[PDB]
């Protein structure tokens, strides 16, 4: 995790990643999806 105020796209620069955890799922996993979050504010009625 790094703070950035850079490119909307990934900024040019070098950073390294470190291992957090190991989970033995053991699944033949073909695909993935990203879950996004919604935000409703004061202003918004929460309507979907």
């Amino acid at each position: 995790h790094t703070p950035i105020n850079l490119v909307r796209d990934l900024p040019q620069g070098f950073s390294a990643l470190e291992p957090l955890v190991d989970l033995p799922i053991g699944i033949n996993i073909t695909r993935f999806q990203t879950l996004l979050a919604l935000h409703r504010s004061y202003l918004t009625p929460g309507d979907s």
Partner: antibody
Amino acid sequence: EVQLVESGGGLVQPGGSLRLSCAASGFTFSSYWMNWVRQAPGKGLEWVANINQDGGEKYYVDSVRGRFTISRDNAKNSLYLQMNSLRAEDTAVYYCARDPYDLYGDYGGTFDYWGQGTLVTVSS
Amino acid sequence: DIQMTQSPSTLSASVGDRVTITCRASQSISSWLAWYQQKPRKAPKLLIYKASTLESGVPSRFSGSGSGTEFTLTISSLQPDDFATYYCQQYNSYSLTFGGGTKVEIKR
């Protein structure tokens, strides 16, 4: 005639607050991002703040962050910028301009329409 | 963030000549650059978007090109109307930034 008229400039002492407003016409106001850019005479043009079409997402330059809040009333067709803790440095001419969608990304068009400007002076 | 630096800061050219103002970003903006024209005390007008697309109603004399980090706005045949300060801006990433501004003046 796409138009943007700014109002609210004036003389303000340090620490004071003002709110400028920009009334828009000639386009579907609700559908576009609006920004406020300022030109401080000795210095150049600077981008102050931006608001998403929905009105929720709001971005600001670091200098202004606690001090300024940008908001809009679509029914009103008005955009506002409330300023606080004015400093001498904030003196500038503030222009409301209609921005492009950030989503366009690498193909960003930039600010298509601009208002005449409101002059705010911060001095004792 | 990214800093845009225009050059030259000021220039004087005769009418009809070709003027070329350059803008250099600190890092790759990609195509995300636009140009603005500003007259004294008047608000800026958008000349070019996406580095080379002419905004509606802008005179054809103005053109903009760019590749990599460096971009250029050329004015094929300078006219007296053209007197102004020209600014480049990069919408590529936040915060949005404008160049210092290049003042153009009619040489007589």
